[PDB]
Amino acid sequence: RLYWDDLKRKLSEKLDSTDFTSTIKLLNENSYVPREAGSQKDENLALYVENQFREFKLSKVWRDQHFVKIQVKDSAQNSVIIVDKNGRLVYLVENPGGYVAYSKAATVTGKLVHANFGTKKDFEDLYTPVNGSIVIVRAGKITFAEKVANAESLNAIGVLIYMDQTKFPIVNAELSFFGHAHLGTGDPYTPGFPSTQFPPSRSSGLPNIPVQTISRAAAEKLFGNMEGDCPSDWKTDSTCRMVTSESKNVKLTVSNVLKEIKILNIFGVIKGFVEPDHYVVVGAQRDAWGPGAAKSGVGTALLLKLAQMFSDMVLKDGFQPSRSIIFASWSAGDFGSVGATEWLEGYLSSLHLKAFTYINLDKAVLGTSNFKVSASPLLYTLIEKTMQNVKHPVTGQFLYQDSNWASKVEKLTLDNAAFPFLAYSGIPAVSFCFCEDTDYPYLGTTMDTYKELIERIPELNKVARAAAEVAGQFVIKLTHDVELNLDYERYNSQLLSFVRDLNQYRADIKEMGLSLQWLYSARGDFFRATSRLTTDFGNAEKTDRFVMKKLNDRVMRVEYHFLSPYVSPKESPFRHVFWGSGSHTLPALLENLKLRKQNNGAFNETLFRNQLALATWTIQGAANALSGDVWDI
């Protein structure tokens, strides 16, 4: 067993002589260049990664194979067409190079209406009714899946998406791009039974309208046939317009088809010396529509180098992780973390007893200016201590520069592989990156190349190196300390913050005959439960692996006990009342209640009483799950 100081030094010095750019460049070679999930090139890289793991001599390397239905574009072209309502003659504007996976295959003709980013707010602020019209929106702010849903929610009949030059200062205006519009993760077409025969989807999160990505040039050509200046508030090109002329409307034809593919998740593992049946999981997306250097290459490179380093530290330098470290190369990430989700779904309710943390490595390097982090609050302390002794690659200062960084942390979103881990599986998760206030413009394009990457970021090797150090320090701390570096006390602030918000309606809870007393008591009981647990840790003999196991297991279950037990994972997979999606999340409870200031019928008093109940029960349950022995109350 080594000292944390030595492990820190060892990791750092191994990192110093590590060549990241070579690997990123290597992954950008023609053997791997265009690696859409399931393709032979994806399969090539999968084989290469797998071989590398074998050369690193990890305890065991294996395959997690899955068959899934994705959507690819048909031999028939998707098309964007302008129609003259006079005589109904059509003019072809574009056959897009790209497409949007999970779009309804259909042909729709209507008026075209701009809706900015297609955010929920953008739609309400519209002075043009979207109903029965095709909508065009800029990429960014929110996922394609959300834009489609918001629009579909207002009865739009189709969606176009372009990259405006203000948000995406790309010189080539003919650039086409890719994404998906499945409002979830995993395979949307997952019949619980094999079939020839065709069953409907139900609560799939799939679009019922066609959605399609277009080049900025094609959008500006559409603007050429539209009227109305865009609000300066949108801060967009002067090109932009709002609505088709009276005599014209647009026709969209999407003919994407379902294809079944064989994806491979490639796994390596360094077994733990004390509790090998518990793991930290480190993963990266291996697939990409185009070259996907930043989208896929960076992550996969870090995955490979981290795997190599840790294998060397165990075999040469005497590092002895208490718990196991699993390295995961995912496929079909581009379709909604499909690879990751399929694997997660094998262990719906059991995984949280083995995996205590997931570290995502996707898009860790996109810029230089900033260091962003999204994570479970359970990892805020680990993250903080890690930023306090990792240096900025350009700047030289420690990453930790703001004592208040934790309150400004944004939550994991659906397009992040870290999301299903936390919100569906109840495993604390963290994603982080070096970046700007600007999205990396080339993501999802054929311009996401190494050359492009090394050009916007000439210090690529140093920056990737800093990204590896944070992930590496995470992984060491997590498998070295006898306690788990999961700060369960953090959820007191979260509950406090939530009740603090809720208490801004102590009046409206009166006019409904409701007391919030049982909820306050749940919050109090959780506080007590954490306090008792901290005391127990302090009074425990750190060398007694039996008592530590028992205390650590309690910590490992905190996250999962915030998954609502009162909703089916099939109907709503994202059960986490803090971080998931649906009417069972604390945020939903607040939004339903904010709709009570308006005397409009949007408020749903009944729903709220149920939400209040389920929240209280969930929180009580978590407090009770943490308290320990049934005679201690």
């Binding site: 072209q77 059509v90 003019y91 504007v93």
Partner: protein, 172 residues
Amino acid sequence: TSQVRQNYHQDSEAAINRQINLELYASYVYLSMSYYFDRDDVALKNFAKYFLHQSHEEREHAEKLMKLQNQRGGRIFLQDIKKPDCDDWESGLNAMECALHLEKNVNQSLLELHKLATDKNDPHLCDFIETHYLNEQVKAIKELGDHVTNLRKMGAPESGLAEYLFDKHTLG
């Protein structure tokens, strides 16, 4: 519906309108290139003549597509002709490289058009594209490739002598 229309898909009609615009755009690019070489500070008269001829050929290409649209009973829909990507074409070599890129883009559009015509089982339109456009594009691309190669081998763009002599011997 037009009394002459037969086996002519609305998608093909629209694609023909898009191709008309592209041909007109190509005409405009070549017009711009031509007069760049007519500048007193560039002064390569045979480059200017070569590109002006190419410009006029593209207008003929556009006109033939407009004729085709009417022949098949489709309706011509015109859009703005975008200005060329560049104002200053830098050198004879750079202009040739831009023309090569342009002709390859136009070829790709024609191949997409042919794929559509094939998908809609329109053999008349397939034959029209093959007869009047596809080999013309292959010849144009080959010629521009040859020109680019010669200019590079001669030492362009650095060698003003190279572009001068190419102007006289190849384009004269």
